Design a protein around this motif. Structure first.
Motif, PDB file in Angstrom:
ATOM      1  N   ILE A 112       0.817  -1.244  -0.009  1.00 43.00           N
ATOM      2  CA  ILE A 112      -0.057  -0.243   0.119  1.00 43.00           C
ATOM      3  C   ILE A 112       0.702   1.378   0.046  1.00 43.00           C
ATOM      4  N   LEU A 113       1.826   1.258   0.706  1.00 32.77           N
ATOM      5  CA  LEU A 113       2.726   2.475   0.824  1.00 32.77           C
ATOM      6  C   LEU A 113       3.686   2.578  -0.358  1.00 32.77           C
ATOM      7  N   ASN A 114       3.961   1.459  -1.118  1.00 31.52           N
ATOM      8  CA  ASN A 114       4.848   1.504  -2.300  1.00 31.52           C
ATOM      9  C   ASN A 114       3.575   2.250  -3.519  1.00 31.52           C
ATOM     10  N   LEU A 115       2.426   1.558  -3.477  1.00 36.05           N
ATOM     11  CA  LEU A 115       1.430   2.305  -4.433  1.00 36.05           C
ATOM     12  C   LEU A 115       1.350   3.916  -3.972  1.00 36.05           C
ATOM     13  N   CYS A 116       1.370   4.199  -2.562  1.00 42.80           N
ATOM     14  CA  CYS A 116       0.928   5.349  -2.298  1.00 42.80           C
ATOM     15  C   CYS A 116       2.431   6.372  -2.823  1.00 42.80           C
ATOM     16  N   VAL A 117       3.709   5.940  -2.578  1.00 39.71           N
ATOM     17  CA  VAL A 117       4.701   6.474  -2.906  1.00 39.71           C
ATOM     18  C   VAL A 117       4.873   6.652  -4.529  1.00 39.71           C
ATOM     19  N   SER A 150       2.301   6.767  -6.302  1.00 42.38           N
ATOM     20  CA  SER A 150       1.250   7.997  -6.775  1.00 42.38           C
ATOM     21  C   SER A 150       1.675   9.377  -6.450  1.00 42.38           C
ATOM     22  N   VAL A 151       2.480   9.234  -5.155  1.00 43.24           N
ATOM     23  CA  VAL A 151       3.035  10.820  -4.969  1.00 43.24           C
ATOM     24  C   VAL A 151       3.994  11.091  -5.730  1.00 43.24           C
ATOM     25  N   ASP A 152       4.854  10.117  -6.081  1.00 38.97           N
ATOM     26  CA  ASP A 152       5.905  10.532  -7.229  1.00 38.97           C
ATOM     27  C   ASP A 152       5.316  10.865  -8.632  1.00 38.97           C
ATOM     28  N   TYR A 196       2.512  12.399  -8.842  1.00 33.28           N
ATOM     29  CA  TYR A 196       1.919  13.558  -8.896  1.00 33.28           C
ATOM     30  C   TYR A 196       2.921  14.528  -8.775  1.00 33.28           C
ATOM     31  N   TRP A 197       4.023  14.497  -8.050  1.00 34.18           N
ATOM     32  CA  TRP A 197       5.181  15.364  -8.246  1.00 34.18           C
ATOM     33  C   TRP A 197       5.721  15.712  -9.617  1.00 34.18           C
ATOM     34  N   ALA A 198       5.568  14.517 -10.290  1.00 32.46           N
ATOM     35  CA  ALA A 198       6.107  14.630 -11.701  1.00 32.46           C
ATOM     36  C   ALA A 198       5.155  15.313 -12.562  1.00 32.46           C
ATOM     37  N   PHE A 218       9.503  20.238 -13.031  1.00 32.41           N
ATOM     38  CA  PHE A 218      10.720  20.822 -12.821  1.00 32.41           C
ATOM     39  C   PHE A 218      11.082  20.810 -11.297  1.00 32.41           C
ATOM     40  N   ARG A 219      10.425  20.727 -10.366  1.00 31.43           N
ATOM     41  CA  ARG A 219      10.674  20.870  -9.164  1.00 31.43           C
ATOM     42  C   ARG A 219      10.914  19.355  -8.864  1.00 31.43           C
ATOM     43  N   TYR A 220       9.984  18.408  -9.550  1.00 29.33           N
ATOM     44  CA  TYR A 220      10.286  16.857  -9.554  1.00 29.33           C
ATOM     45  C   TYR A 220      11.721  16.328  -9.955  1.00 29.33           C
ATOM     46  N   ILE A 237      15.258   7.808  -0.394  1.00 25.74           N
ATOM     47  CA  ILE A 237      14.597   8.015   0.995  1.00 25.74           C
ATOM     48  C   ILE A 237      13.381   7.898   0.864  1.00 25.74           C
ATOM     49  N   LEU A 238      12.478   8.007  -0.171  1.00 26.05           N
ATOM     50  CA  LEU A 238      10.957   7.965  -0.141  1.00 26.05           C
ATOM     51  C   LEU A 238      10.568   6.323   0.237  1.00 26.05           C
ATOM     52  N   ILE A 239      11.575   5.496  -0.790  1.00 31.08           N
ATOM     53  CA  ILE A 239      11.386   4.055  -0.387  1.00 31.08           C
ATOM     54  C   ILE A 239      11.664   3.623   0.912  1.00 31.08           C
ATOM     55  N   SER A 240      12.711   4.063   1.494  1.00 28.12           N
ATOM     56  CA  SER A 240      13.107   3.792   2.812  1.00 28.12           C
ATOM     57  C   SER A 240      12.130   4.529   3.635  1.00 28.12           C
ATOM     58  N   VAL A 241      11.482   5.486   3.796  1.00 24.37           N
ATOM     59  CA  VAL A 241      10.407   5.946   4.548  1.00 24.37           C
ATOM     60  C   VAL A 241       9.113   4.941   4.475  1.00 24.37           C
ATOM     61  N   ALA A 242       8.570   4.751   3.387  1.00 21.16           N
ATOM     62  CA  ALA A 242       7.625   3.779   3.117  1.00 21.16           C
ATOM     63  C   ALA A 242       8.061   2.230   3.886  1.00 21.16           C
ATOM     64  N   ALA A 249      -6.049   7.825   1.261  1.00 16.56           N
ATOM     65  CA  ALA A 249      -6.671   9.151   1.299  1.00 16.56           C
ATOM     66  C   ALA A 249      -5.913  10.172   0.557  1.00 16.56           C
ATOM     67  N   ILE A 250      -4.552  10.159   0.753  1.00 11.23           N
ATOM     68  CA  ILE A 250      -3.381  10.865  -0.199  1.00 11.23           C
ATOM     69  C   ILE A 250      -3.321  10.291  -1.401  1.00 11.23           C
ATOM     70  N   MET A 251      -3.417   8.849  -1.688  1.00  8.08           N
ATOM     71  CA  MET A 251      -3.486   8.190  -3.026  1.00  8.08           C
ATOM     72  C   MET A 251      -4.661   8.714  -3.954  1.00  8.08           C
TER      73      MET A 251
HETATM   74  C1  LIG Z   1       6.183  14.220  -1.322  1.00  7.58           C
HETATM   75  C2  LIG Z   1       5.730  14.311   0.015  1.00  7.58           C
HETATM   76  C3  LIG Z   1       4.831  13.161   0.367  1.00  7.58           C
HETATM   77  C4  LIG Z   1       3.625  12.918  -0.011  1.00  7.58           C
HETATM   78  C5  LIG Z   1       2.897  11.608   0.422  1.00  7.58           C
HETATM   79  C6  LIG Z   1       3.476  10.684   1.057  1.00  7.58           C
HETATM   80  C7  LIG Z   1       4.901  10.990   1.878  1.00  7.58           C
HETATM   81  C8  LIG Z   1       5.443   9.975   2.877  1.00  7.58           C
HETATM   82  C9  LIG Z   1       5.044   8.496   2.240  1.00  7.58           C
HETATM   83  C10 LIG Z   1       3.820   8.061   2.808  1.00  7.58           C
HETATM   84  C11 LIG Z   1       3.974   6.791   3.648  1.00  7.58           C
HETATM   85  C12 LIG Z   1       3.001   9.154   3.467  1.00  7.58           C
HETATM   86  O1  LIG Z   1       2.882   7.707   1.520  1.00  7.58           O
HETATM   87  C13 LIG Z   1       5.496  12.077   1.245  1.00  7.58           C
HETATM   88  C14 LIG Z   1       6.793  12.318   1.830  1.00  7.58           C
HETATM   89  C15 LIG Z   1       7.706  13.431   1.213  1.00  7.58           C
HETATM   90  C16 LIG Z   1       8.873  13.601   1.906  1.00  7.58           C
HETATM   91  O2  LIG Z   1       8.680  13.933   3.282  1.00  7.58           O
HETATM   92  N1  LIG Z   1       6.859  14.691   0.772  1.00  7.58           N
HETATM   93  C17 LIG Z   1       7.178  15.941   1.224  1.00  7.58           C
HETATM   94  O3  LIG Z   1       6.446  17.078   0.928  1.00  7.58           O
HETATM   95  C18 LIG Z   1       8.380  16.660   2.179  1.00  7.58           C
HETATM   96  C19 LIG Z   1       9.088  17.650   1.837  1.00  7.58           C
HETATM   97  C20 LIG Z   1       9.968  17.563   0.769  1.00  7.58           C
HETATM   98 CL1  LIG Z   1      10.341  15.895  -0.077  1.00  7.58          CL
HETATM   99  C21 LIG Z   1      10.619  18.754   0.256  1.00  7.58           C
HETATM  100  C22 LIG Z   1      10.069  20.173   0.568  1.00  7.58           C
HETATM  101  C23 LIG Z   1       9.389  20.117   1.538  1.00  7.58           C
HETATM  102  C24 LIG Z   1       8.630  18.947   1.972  1.00  7.58           C
HETATM  103 CL2  LIG Z   1       7.481  19.315   3.517  1.00  7.58          CL
END
Ligand SMILES: C[C@H]1c2cccc(CCC(C)(C)O)c2C[C@H](CO)N1C(=O)Cc1c(Cl)cccc1Cl
Ligand SMILES: CC(C)CCC[C@@H](C)[C@H]1CC[C@H]2[C@@H]3CC=C4C[C@@H](O)CC[C@]4(C)[C@H]3CC[C@]12C
Ligand SMILES: NCCc1ccc(O)c(O)c1
Lengths: 340, 128, 58, 275, 236
Positions: D92-97, D99-101, D103-105, D110-112, D123-128, D171-173
Motif C-alpha cells: 500500500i505504501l509503495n503504491l502511495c509513493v 502515486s505521490v511521485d 503527482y510530483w512529476a 521541474f521541481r520533480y 529516501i522515499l522508498i526507505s520511508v515507506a 486518502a492521499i493516493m
Molecule cells: C512528497 C511528500 C509526500 C507525499 C505523500 C506521502 C509521503 C510520505 C510517504 C507516505 C507513507 C505518507 O505515503 C510524502 C513524503 C515526502 C517527503 O517528506 N513529501 C514532502 O512533501 C516532504 C518535503 C520535501 Cl520532499 C521537500 C520540501 C518540503 C517537504 Cl514538506
C-alpha cells in the motif's frame, strides 16, 4: 559558349569515363570469390565491460592504441576517458560546448579530440602535469559542425566538419596546415589509414572522397553509396575502407580499385548506419545501425555474423581496438557496451 | 551514384502545361521520399511538391497547390511534376531534390545551394 | 554565375585527377584483401572466439 | 480435493501469477538499465519487491493453511502475521509513493526533476518501508495483533494500523491521482485545443480516466473491500472470518496485478518480451 | 602495481563518479533547448529576449529556479540533417518562425518543411516543438497593406476561418487573427498529423508583445515535461 554548361558536360563525360574505367577493372566482385574461403558463422559477442557514466546520449568515441583507455563524447558536456580493462573512468573532461559529435584518442595517449556544433576542435591534454584535464589546443577554423576527427600524432590531426570541408589541423600552433576541399555535402566521418599517409572521409553526398595528408589534395572519390555516409573505417590492410550511410547499406571500397567491392545489404534492416569499424584482420565489419543493434558484417561473405543486443538507442559511435581485442559500442542511451 | 537529371521545361506560355522527367538513377528510387524544389532568379531554393516512397503522402507548396501535380514512377525510377495552369511567377530552375534518409517521411532538401541529392536543374520559365 | 564556374572547375579538376590513376582489377583487389584478411586472422580476438585467458575483457 | 480443489487451484495460481509478475519486474529492472536508471522506476522496483515478499513469505503460508485447514508452522504464526501486515502495508505504501511521485512529476515536473533525485527516491522508498516496519514488526513484537492462529487485529490497533497502513495512504493516493486527473485532463483539453483546432477530445480524455481506474480503481476495488472489513471485523452485521479470508486474498490480488498495472508501460514491456 | 595503481585508478574512478553525479543533478535540472528558424525568422530577437544573452551559439536562462540551455544554431551551415540529430535528448525545439514571412520567398512553407522534417524526424519525433510565430508585429499590418497575402502562397486560406477556440488579440482585425491562426494551424496541421502522442506542438504568437518570452517557454516546457511524464504513466 555556355562555359557553365560546357564544364557541366565535361564533368559528366569525365564521370562516365571514370565509371567505365571502374567497370573495366570490375570483371569480378568481392562476392565472386566467396566459394574459396570458409565463412565465419553467427558468432554472438557479449558485453564484457559495461560503461555507464555518461549523462546525455553518447555521440562519439575512440579507442586508444593501448586498447585499454577509450574516450567517448556525449551531449552532456563530458568527455569520459574510460578504462576498458577495469571499467573505470580515468578522466571526465568538462567540455566547453554541450553538443559534441567527434572523439579521437591520440596515438600516444597524451591527447584527445572533441568538438561538435560549436565548429571548434577542443584538444585536451591527458598525460599533462597540471593534474586534471584542460584544453590543449582550440582548433576553431571550421564553419560547420565538426562531425568526426582522427589523431595522426600529438602535432597534427584532421577534422571532418559540416562545412563540406575537411582540414588537417596542427596542435602546435592551431591552424589548418591544409584544407581538404571537394565534398559537396557536409562531411560526417573520416578514417585514418594504418600508414597514416592518406585518409578517406565519408560525407553526406554518398561520396567518401579519399584524401592525402601530405599533398592535401583529393586522391580518389568513391560514389558507390546512396545516402549520407555517417560512418567510415579504413581496412586494416590500408588499401580499402568501409562506409556506413543512411541507405541501410555498408560498402567496402578499395583505394586500388576506386569503386565498391562488397555491398553489406540486408532487407531486414532499413535504418541508416553511423558506426563502422573493422576488426584486427578486417574480416568482421562492425557496423552500428540505427535499429539499436550492431550487425557484425562479414567483409568477405556478404552476411552479418550476429547482431549485437544491449543498446536500446541509436549507436552513433563504435570502434575496435588496435589489436582487435574488443569493440566498444556506444549508443544514444548514455551507455558503452564493449563486445568481444 | 546519386544523380538526378530533369528533362523537359523550357520557355512556354503562362497558363499552359509542362512536365519534367527527373531521371533518378544510382539509388532505390522506390525507397526515398522524392520531391521537387525550385529556385527563382533572385530567390532561394523553395520546396514545390513532394511524394512518398510509394506514392501516398503527396503534398505541394501553396504557390503550386492545385496547379502542379507530382507523380513518381517506381518502375522506371523517374519522378514527374505535371505542371498545369502555369503562372508568371513559376519562372524558376526546378530541382529534383531527394530526401537523403530512405524509409523516412522527413528531410532537409529545402535548404540552400550545394545540396547533395538534388537535381541538376531545368530552367522552367514562362512568358507574359 | 562565376561561383558556379569555379565550382565546376574544381569538380572537373578533381575528376581529371581521379581518372588518371592506376585502378587495379577488382579481382586482384579482392585477392589481396582476402590475403591480408587470412594472414591477420590468426591474431583477431573478435574473428575467432578468444578464451578468457589472454583476453582482458571476458 | 473435490470441492476445495477449486479454491486450492485458485490460491495456487494467484501465488504463481504474483511470483511470476514480481520476478519478471525484478529481472527487468536488475538485468536491464532502462528500467533502473530512471528515478521514477525506483518506486516501481520497490513495489515489485514488496509484492515478491508478499508472494514468498505471506501468500504461500496463508494458501497452504487454507487448502489444508490447519496452520503449518504453528510456532511461527506471530512472525507470519508480522510478515503479512508488513507486506500488505508495504504494498500500500509503495503504491502511495508511486502515486505521490507521479503527482510530483505531473504537478511540478521541474521541481520533480530538481528535488526527486535518486537519493530522494531511495529516501522515499526507505520511508515507506520503515513505516511498514513500525506498523508490522514493532506492534507484533509487543503483541498488538491480539485481544489455529488466525490474524485477529486488536480493535484498538486495527483502527490505528489500517487507518495509516491503507486509509491514510488511500486518502492521499486519492488526491494525488485526482490532482493528476485534473492536470492530465487540463493538458488533454490543451491538446484538444491544438489537435481538434488543427483539423478544424474525449477519446483520449477517457484514456486517462480508464488508466487511472486501473492504477487506483483496481487498487481500491481490491484492497478496500479487505480493509473495510479489516476495520469492522475487529469491532464486532459484520462478516465472519471465513468469508473474510476471501477478501484477504482479494487484497493480495492487487499485489498480483501491480506488475500488470504499473509495469505495463512501453518501457517495461520492452524488457518483458526479451526476458 | 597490484593495488598501487589499481586502487588509485579505482579512487580516481570514484572521484569521477562523484563529479558526474554532481553534474547529473544540473543536467537533469537544466532543460536543453534547440533554438532554430527558417533563416532570419526573428530568432535574433529571441536570443535578445532570453536572459539578455562565442557569439550566437548557446544561451542559458533560469526562471522559477529552472535553468535552461537554449542552443542557437545561427552559425552552422544550411544543410540540417545531421547536426539536428544531436538534439535527440533535447527537451524542447523552439522553432522561431517569422509569421509575416509567407511571401518574403515563402518562408512559411520553408519553415513548414523544416517543421515537418523536425516533426516527422527519426530522432526529433520524441521531442516537442515550441512554435514561436515571431514577426507578428509585422503581421499585424502585413495582411491589410496588401504587400503580403496568404492566398498567393497558401490556397487553403480561402477555406479557412478564425477558429472558435481561438484567443484573438484585443484590437486586431479579424483578418489578422484569421491569418495569424492560419499559420498556427498550418504548423499544427502537420504537427497533429503524426499522431504518436510523444510530442505536441506549442504554438505561441511571438514578437507581438514584448513580455518575457522565456516565461512562455517556461510554461510550454512545463507542459512538455508534464505530457512527457503523462505519456510515461499512460495518463495522456
Ligand atoms: C512528497 C511528500 C509526500 C507525499 C505523500 C506521502 C509521503 C510520505 C510517504 C507516505 C507513507 C505518507 O505515503 C510524502 C513524503 C515526502 C517527503 O517528506 N513529501 C514532502 O512533501 C516532504 C518535503 C520535501 Cl520532499 C521537500 C520540501 C518540503 C517537504 Cl514538506
Ligand atoms: C527485511 C524486510 C524488512 C524487507 C526489507 C526491504 C528490502 C526488500 C528492500 C528495502 C530497500 C530496497 C532497495 C532500495 C534501492 C535499491 C536500488 C535499486 O537500484 C536496486 C534495488 C535496491 C537495492 C532495493 C532492493 C530491495 C530493498 C533492499
Ligand atoms: N493481509 C492483510 C492484513 C493487513 C494488511 C495491512 C494492514 O495495514 C493491516 O492492518 C492488516
Amino acid at each position: 559558349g555556355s562555359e557553365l554548361d560546357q564544364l557541366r558536360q565535361e564533368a559528366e563525360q569525365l564521370k562516365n569515363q571514370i565509371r567505365d574505367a571502374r567497370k573495366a577493372c570490375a570483371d569480378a566482385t568481392l562476392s565472386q570469390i566467396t566459394n574459396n574461403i570458409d565463412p565465419v558463422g553467427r558468432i554472438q559477442m557479449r558485453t564484457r565491460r559495461t560503461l555507464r557514466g555518461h549523462l546525455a546520449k553518447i555521440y562519439a568515441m575512440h579507442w586508444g592504441t593501448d586498447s585499454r583507455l577509450l574516450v567517448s563524447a556525449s551531449q552532456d558536456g563530458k568527455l569520459i576517458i574510460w578504462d576498458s580493462y577495469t571499467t573505470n573512468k580515468v578522466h571526465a573532461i568538462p567540455l566547453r560546448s554541450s553538443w559534441v559529435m567527434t572523439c579521437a584518442y591520440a596515438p600516444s595517449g597524451n591527447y584527445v579530440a572533441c568538438g561538435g556544433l560549436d565548429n571548434i576542435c577542443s584538444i585536451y591534454n591527458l598525460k599533462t602535469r597540471e593534474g586534471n584535464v584542460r584544453v590543449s589546443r582550440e582548433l576553431a577554423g571550421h564553419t560547420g559542425y565538426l562531425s568526426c576527427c582522427r589523431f595522426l600524432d600529438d602535432n597534427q590531426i584532421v577534422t571532418s566538419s559540416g562545412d563540406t570541408t575537411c582540414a588537417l589541423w596542427d596542435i602546435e600552433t592551431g591552424q589548418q596546415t591544409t584544407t581538404f576541399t571537394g565534398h559537396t555535402g557536409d562531411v560526417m566521418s573520416l578514417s585514418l589509414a594504418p600508414d597514416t599517409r592518406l585518409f578517406v572521409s565519408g560525407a553526406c553526398d554518398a561520396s567518401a572522397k579519399l584524401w592525402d595528408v601530405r599533398e592535401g589534395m583529393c586522391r580518389q572519390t568513391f560514389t558507390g553509396h546512396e545516402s549520407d555516409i555517417n560512418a567510415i573505417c579504413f581496412f586494416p590492410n590500408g588499401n580499402a575502407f568501409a562506409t556506413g550511410s543512411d541507405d541501410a547499406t555498408c560498402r567496402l571500397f578499395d583505394l586500388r580499385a576506386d569503386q565498391e567491392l562488397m555491398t553489406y545489404s540486408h532487407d531486414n534492416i532499413i535504418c541508416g548506419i553511423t558506426s563502422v569499424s573493422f576488426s584486427k584482420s578486417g574480416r568482421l565489419l562492425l557496423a552500428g545501425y540505427d535499429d539499436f543493434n550492431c550487425n557484425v558484417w562479414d567483409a568477405l561473405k556478404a552476411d552479418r555474423a550476429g547482431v549485437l543486443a544491449g543498446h536500446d538507442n541509436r549507436v552513433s559511435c563504435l570502434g575496435v581496438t588496435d589489436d582487435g581485442m574488443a569493440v566498444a559500442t556506444g549508443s544514444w542511451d548514455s551507455f558503452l557496451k564493449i563486445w568481444n | 551514384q546519386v544523380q538526378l537529371q530533369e528533362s523537359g521545361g523550357g520557355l512556354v506560355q503562362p497558363g499552359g502545361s509542362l512536365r519534367l522527367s527527373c531521371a533518378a538513377s544510382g539509388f532505390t528510387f522506390s525507397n526515398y521520399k522524392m520531391n521537387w524544389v525550385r529556385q527563382a532568379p533572385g530567390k532561394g531554393l523553395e520546396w514545390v511538391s513532394d511524394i512518398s516512397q510509394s506514392g501516398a503522402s503527396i503534398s505541394y507548396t501553396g504557390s503550386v497547390k492545385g496547379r502542379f501535380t507530382i507523380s513518381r514512377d517506381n518502375a522506371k525510377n523517374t519522378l514527374y511534376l505535371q505542371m498545369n495552369s502555369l503562372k508568371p511567377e513559376d519562372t524558376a530552375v526546378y530541382y529534383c531534390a531527394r530526401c537523403p534518409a530512405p524509409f523516412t517521411r522527413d528531410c532537409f532538401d529545402v535548404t540552400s545551394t550545394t545540396y547533395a541529392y538534388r537535381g541538376q536543374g531545368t530552367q522552367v520559365t514562362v512568358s507574359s | 554565375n562565376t561561383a558556379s564556374i569555379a565550382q565546376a572547375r574544381k569538380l572537373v579538376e578533381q575528376l581529371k585527377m581521379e581518372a588518371n590513376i592506376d585502378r587495379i582489377k577488382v579481382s586482384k583487389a579482392a585477392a589481396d584483401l582476402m590475403a591480408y584478411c587470412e594472414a591477420h586472422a590468426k591474431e583477431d580476438p573478435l574473428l575467432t572466439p578468444v578464451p578468457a585467458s589472454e583476453n582482458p575483457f571476458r | 480435493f473435490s470441492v476445495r480443489i477449486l479454491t486450492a487451484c485458485f490460491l495456487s495460481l494467484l501465488i504463481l501469477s504474483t511470483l511470476l509478475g514480481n520476478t519478471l519486474v525484478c529481472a527487468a529492472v536488475i538485468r536491464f538499465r532502462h528500467l533502473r536508471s530512471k528515478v521514477t522506476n525506483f518506486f516501481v522496483i520497490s513495489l515489485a519487491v514488496s509484492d515478491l515478499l508478499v508472494a514468498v513469505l505471506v501468500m504461500p503460508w496463508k494458501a497452504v493453511a487454507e487448502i489444508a485447514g490447519f496452520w503449518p508452522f504453528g510456532s511461527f504464526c506471530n512472525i507470519w502475521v508480522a510478515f503479512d501486515i508488513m507486506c500488505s502495508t508495504a504494498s500500500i505504501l509503495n503504491l502511495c509513493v508511486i502515486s505521490v511521485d507521479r503527482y510530483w512529476a505531473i504537478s511540478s515536473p521541474f521541481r520533480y526533476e530538481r528535488k526527486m533525485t535518486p537519493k530522494a527516491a531511495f529516501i522515499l522508498i526507505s520511508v515507506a518501508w520503515t513505516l511498514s516496519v513500525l506498523i508490522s514488526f514493532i506492534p507484533v513484537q509487543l503483541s498488538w495483533h491480539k485481544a489455529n492462529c488466525d490474524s485477529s487485529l486488536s480493535r484498538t490497533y486495527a483502527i490505528s494500523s489500517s487507518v495509516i497502513s491503507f486509509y491514510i495512504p488511500v486518502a492521499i493516493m486519492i488526491v494525488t491521482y485526482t490532482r493528476i486527473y485534473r492536470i492530465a485532463q487540463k493538458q488533454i483539453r490543451r491538446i484538444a485545443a491544438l489537435e481538434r483546432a488543427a483539423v478544424h477530445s474525449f477519446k483520449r480524455e477517457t484514456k486517462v480516466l480508464k488508466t487511472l481506474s486501473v492504477i487506483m480503481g483496481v487498487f481500491v476495488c481490491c484492497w478496500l473491500p479487505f480493509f473495510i472489513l479489516n476495520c469492522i471485523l475487529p469491532f464486532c452485521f459484520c462478516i465472519d472470518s471465513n468469508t473474510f479470508d476471501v477478501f484477504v486474498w482479494f487484497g493480495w490480488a492487487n499485489s498480483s496485478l501491480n506488475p500488470i498495472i504499473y509495469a505495463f508501460n512501453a518501457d517495461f514491456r520492452k524488457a518483458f518480451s526479451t526476458l | 602495481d597490484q593495488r598501487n595503481e589499481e586502487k588509485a585508478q579505482r579512487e580516481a574512478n570514484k572521484k569521477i563518479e562523484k563529479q558526474l553525479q554532481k553534474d547529473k543533478q544540473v543536467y537533469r535540472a537544466t532543460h536543453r533547448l534547440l533554438l532554430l528558424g527558417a533563416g532570419e525568422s526573428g530568432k535574433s530577437t529571441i536570443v535578445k529576449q532570453m536572459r539578455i544573452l562565442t557569439g550566437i551559439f548557446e544561451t542559458k536562462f533560469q526562471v522559477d529556479k529552472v535553468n535552461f540551455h537554449m542552443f542557437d544554431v545561427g552559425a552552422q551551415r544550411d544543410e540540417r540533417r545531421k547536426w539536428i540529430q544531436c538534439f535527440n535528448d533535447v527537451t524542447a525545439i523552439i522553432f522561431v518562425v517569422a509569421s509575416s514571412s509567407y511571401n518574403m520567398t515563402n518562408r512559411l512553407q520553408e519553415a513548414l518543411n523544416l517543421f515537418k522534417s523536425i516533426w516527422n524526424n527519426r530522432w526529433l519525433r520524441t521531442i516537442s516543438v515550441i512554435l514561436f510565430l515571431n514577426k507578428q508585429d509585422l503581421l499585424a499590418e502585413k495582411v491589410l497593406a496588401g504587400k503580403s497575402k496568404i492566398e498567393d502562397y497558401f490556397p487553403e486560406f480561402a477555406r479557412y476561418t478564425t477558429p472558435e477556440d481561438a484567443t484573438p488579440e484585443p484590437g486586431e482585425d479579424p483578418r489578422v487573427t484569421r491569418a495569424k491562426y492560419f499559420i498556427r494551424d498550418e504548423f499544427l496541421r502537420i504537427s497533429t498529423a503524426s499522431g504518436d502522442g510523444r510530442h505536441y506542438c506549442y504554438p505561441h504568437f511571438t514578437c507581438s508583445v514584448d513580455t518575457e518570452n522565456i516565461r512562455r517557454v517556461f510554461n510550454d516546457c512545463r507542459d512538455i515535461i508534464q505530457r512527457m511524464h503523462l505519456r510515461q504513466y499512460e495518463l495522456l
